[PDB]
Amino acid sequence: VEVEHWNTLRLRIYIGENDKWEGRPLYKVIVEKLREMGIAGATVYRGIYGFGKKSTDLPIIVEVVDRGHNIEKVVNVIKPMIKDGMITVEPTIVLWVG
Amino acid sequence: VEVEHWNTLRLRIYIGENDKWEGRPLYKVIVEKLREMGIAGATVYRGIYGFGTDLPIIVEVVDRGHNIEKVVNVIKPMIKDGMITVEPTIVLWVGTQEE
Amino acid sequence: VEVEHWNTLRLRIYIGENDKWEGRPLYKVIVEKLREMGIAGATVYRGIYGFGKIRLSTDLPIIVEVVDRGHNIEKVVNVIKPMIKDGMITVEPTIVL
Amino acid sequence: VEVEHWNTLRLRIYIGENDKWEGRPLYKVIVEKLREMGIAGATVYRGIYGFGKIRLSTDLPIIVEVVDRGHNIEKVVNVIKPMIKDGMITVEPTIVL
Amino acid sequence: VEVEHWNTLRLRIYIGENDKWEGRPLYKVIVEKLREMGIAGATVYRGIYGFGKKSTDLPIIVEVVDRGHNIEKVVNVIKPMIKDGMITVEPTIVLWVG
Amino acid sequence: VEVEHWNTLRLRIYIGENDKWEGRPLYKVIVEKLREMGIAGATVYRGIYGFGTDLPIIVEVVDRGHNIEKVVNVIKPMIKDGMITVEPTIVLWVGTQEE
Numbered sequence: 001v002e003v004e005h006w007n008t009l010r011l012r013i014y015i016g017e018n019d020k021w022e023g024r025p026l027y028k029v030i031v032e033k034l035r036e037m038g039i040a041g042a043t044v045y046r047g048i049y050g051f052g053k054k055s056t057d058l059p060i061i062v063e064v065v066d067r068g069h070n071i072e073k074v075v076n077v078i079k080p081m082i083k084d085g086m087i088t089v090e091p092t093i094v095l096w097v098g
Numbered sequence: 099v100e101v102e103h104w105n106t107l108r109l110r111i112y113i114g115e116n117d118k119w120e121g122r123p124l125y126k127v128i129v130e131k132l133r134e135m136g137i138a139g140a141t142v143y144r145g146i147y148g149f150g151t152d153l154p155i156i157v158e159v160v161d162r163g164h165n166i167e168k169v170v171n172v173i174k175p176m177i178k179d180g181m182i183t184v185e186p187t188i189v190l191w192v193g194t195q196e197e
Numbered sequence: 198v199e200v201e202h203w204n205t206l207r208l209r210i211y212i213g214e215n216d217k218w219e220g221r222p223l224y225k226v227i228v229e230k231l232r233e234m235g236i237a238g239a240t241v242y243r244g245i246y247g248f249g250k251i252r253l254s255t256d257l258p259i260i261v262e263v264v265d266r267g268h269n270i271e272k273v274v275n276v277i278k279p280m281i282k283d284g285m286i287t288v289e290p291t292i293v294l
Numbered sequence: 295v296e297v298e299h300w301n302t303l304r305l306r307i308y309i310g311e312n313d314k315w316e317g318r319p320l321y322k323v324i325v326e327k328l329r330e331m332g333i334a335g336a337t338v339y340r341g342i343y344g345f346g347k348i349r350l351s352t353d354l355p356i357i358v359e360v361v362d363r364g365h366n367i368e369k370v371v372n373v374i375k376p377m378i379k380d381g382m383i384t385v386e387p388t389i390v391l
Numbered sequence: 392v393e394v395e396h397w398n399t400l401r402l403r404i405y406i407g408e409n410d411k412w413e414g415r416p417l418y419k420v421i422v423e424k425l426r427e428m429g430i431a432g433a434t435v436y437r438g439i440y441g442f443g444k445k446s447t448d449l450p451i452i453v454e455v456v457d458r459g460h461n462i463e464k465v466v467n468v469i470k471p472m473i474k475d476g477m478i479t480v481e482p483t484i485v486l487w488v489g
Numbered sequence: 490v491e492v493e494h495w496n497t498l499r500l501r502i503y504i505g506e507n508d509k510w511e512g513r514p515l516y517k518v519i520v521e522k523l524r525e526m527g528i529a530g531a532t533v534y535r536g537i538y539g540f541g542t543d544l545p546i547i548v549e550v551v552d553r554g555h556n557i558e559k560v561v562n563v564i565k566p567m568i569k570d571g572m573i574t575v576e577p578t579i580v581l582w583v584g585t586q587e588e
């Protein structure tokens with residue numbers, strides 16, 4: 001019955017591990033921005049293989065669960081930095097925290 | 099067409115690789131529980147980085163929303179700090195009989 | 198205000214790292230077929246532990262994730278059901294931006 | 295931050311206003327059984343027009359909507375499938391606050 | 392591809408037609424508030440029958456499709472006014488407008 | 490268990506009872522279209538009140554998300570002002586064969 005929010009969204013950012021932004025690993029910059037943006041949190045996963053119609057470059061997935069508006073901000077910031085990968089989003093229910 | 103269940107939910111427990119319980123790893127204890135409560139199954143992942151050093155540990159469980167809640171109750175207290183999430187999903191297959 | 202595709206779904210296939218199909222690592226076989234079929238993409242994860250409903254506990258979980266249009270996913274599931282023994286396949290909507 | 299129930303779903307049953315089951319208006323029969331079973335609730339709508347895949351065009355649509363926990367909906371669908379001829383039953387999640 | 396929003400929510404308010412608030416029909420007051428609240432819009436339906444474990448009182452359903460935050464406001468305003476009925480919410484995608 | 494489709498979407502077209510097209514009621518014209526494009530089916534509702542006198546008219550269509558989009562294109566222009574919505578749904582049955 002108790003839930004933090006019912007309009008929470010799960011954002012997933014798929015990029016290659018070697019993708020770069022101004023010489024730095026794109027995922028680190030992305031995670032860096034999320035931090036100074038005051039976003040709830042994030043989890044980064046590294047796949048063992050991946051491919052996108054549109055492998056020395058393992059997949060890295062940056063996942064962020066937050067309120068809708070916050071996630072909209074993030075997409076608007078990160079869209080420019082990503083020329084190859086994908087961004088998905090779907091609702092989810094957050095039950096606990098700390 | 100055929101599916102296994104259209105009433106299932108995906109439970110995701112986000113904790114810390116270093117989180118402990120009564121002396122043991124919080125994820126190993128949870129999985130033990132889940133296995134003794136008769137849950138459908140579970141899959142544990144370890145991220146490379148996370149913020150909410152410590153590696154994020156995510157135990158995932160897909161089952162009747164009615165087992166998931168049974169699971170939520172028994173774990174809500176053990177998770178002093180972290181996050182629990184849940185959302186619908188359809189289980190299309192398991193692969194017990196081929197035809 | 199602009200999303201890439203119409204009706205996309207996220208397929209997740211769970212199997213064992215040690216699973217095989219005709220002497221080959223089942224997941225690589227699955228990924229291969231997906232590519233051949235012309236699927237939008239796929240990501241493969243390796244878990245550190247997992248259990249279901251006779252498999253070694255040291256047999257790590259492998260999750261093959263595919264995000265694509267509905268008919269495509271339908272087609273994928275149609276092709277890989279025969280190769281999934283005692284695993285699991287899930288699907289649910291998502292929006293790809 | 296407080297929702298009433300865990301895993302609720304919205305069942306929608308589509309049938310014809312003129313449909314019958316043992317000489318009675320099928321929808322009233324469905325609603326009756328739902329009540330007997332102890333279902334959380336139900337709402338019935340009457341459309342002004344509808345068509346599917348031999349029924350009069352003047353035979354208005356009747357939609358029986360049920361919002362309840364998963365197992366309950368499972369049970370409902372199990373009971374009314376036999377009474378639904380050339381209609382439609384849909385389901386999808388929802389959160390009841 | 393073109394969509395107004397991806398974090399739109401469909402809110403549904405189920406009450407009886409005779410339900411009242413300070414002597415006026417509860418649904419009219421509800422619709423009245425939504426209007427002076429600047430909400431996107433709303434559609435009211437009247438069922439031909441209904442029942443809630445928790446019929447001379449036909450069901451009235453007030454439906455509102457809007458951004459998440461707006462819908463949160465609405466729930467917070469209307470929750471007090473409703474002692475018998477139900478409030479559901481799930482995501483939806485808005486494609487067009489005017 | 491068995492279902493009809495887990496890939497379907499529910500399309501909802503909100504217009505005005507008085508909205509017209511080339512001289513006819515916008516909803517009657519849409520339904521005509523939907524029937525000639527071979528869509529699974531449709532259900533039309535008339536609210537008692539709405540604001541976005543005029544009665545709100547809602548044509549609902551459940552079908553492959555691939556027919557729904559075919560439908561969206563052909564109607565987006567006809568709907569000068571109103572609203573179109575879409576979201577997933579599972580079609581559990583149709584009732585053609587009992588067993």
Ligand SMILES: Nc1ncnc2c1ncn2[C@@H]1O[C@H](COP(=O)(O)O)[C@@H](O)[C@H]1O
Pocket residue numbers: 014015016047049050051052053054057058059060083084085086237238239240241262263264265
């Ligand atoms: N449709 C998809 N489904 C699952 N994973 C995807 C999909 N599309 C892209 N990816 C992942 O994102 C990465 C794409 O990187 P890139 O090819 O440079 O655009 C791949 O390594 C995949 O693991």
Ligand SMILES: Nc1ncnc2c1ncn2[C@@H]1O[C@H](COP(=O)(O)O)[C@@H](O)[C@H]1O
Pocket residue numbers: 137138139140141142158159160161211212213244246247248249250251252257258259283284285
């Ligand atoms: N209900 C479930 N929830 C999460 N993962 C599952 C579930 N069921 C099966 N799996 C995964 O699929 C595999 C099942 O194979 P097995 O242990 O031989 O039955 C495990 O390694 C799990 O990672």
Ligand SMILES: Nc1ncnc2c1ncn2[C@@H]1O[C@H](COP(=O)(O)O)[C@@H](O)[C@H]1O
Pocket residue numbers: 040041042043044063064065066098112113114147148149150153154155179180181
């Ligand atoms: N909103 C979120 N989205 C994605 N991952 C999260 C989120 N919140 C927490 N996490 C992860 O879950 C773990 C628990 O949070 P913490 O106790 O602060 O370390 C962290 O290691 C994070 O990586």
Ligand SMILES: Nc1ncnc2c1ncn2[C@@H]1O[C@H](COP(=O)(O)O)[C@@H](O)[C@H]1O
Pocket residue numbers: 334335336337338359360361362405406407438440441442443444445448449450451474475476477
């Ligand atoms: N679980 C439900 N599913 C569908 N409709 C419901 C449900 N619960 C309540 N309703 C509708 O909301 C109204 C409840 O009013 P009341 O009994 O006064 O609380 C009924 O007339 C029903 O049409």
Ligand SMILES: Nc1ncnc2c1ncn2[C@@H]1O[C@H](COP(=O)(O)O)[C@@H](O)[C@H]1O
Pocket residue numbers: 308309310341343344345346347348349354355356380381382528529530531532533549550551552
């Ligand atoms: N795909 C659909 N979308 C919306 N309503 C439907 C759909 N299929 C069936 N229906 C409803 O179910 C009834 C079908 O019965 P029939 O016309 O005899 O085949 C119609 O009156 C519709 O209101």
Ligand SMILES: Nc1ncnc2c1ncn2[C@@H]1O[C@H](COP(=O)(O)O)[C@@H](O)[C@H]1O
Pocket residue numbers: 431432433434435454455456457489503504505538539540541544545546570571572
């Ligand atoms: N956001 C919304 N939620 C529920 N109903 C709506 C919404 N927006 C528009 N409508 C309905 O759709 C119809 C079209 O809007 P309008 O052209 O302004 O009259 C109206 O009669 C409203 O009742």
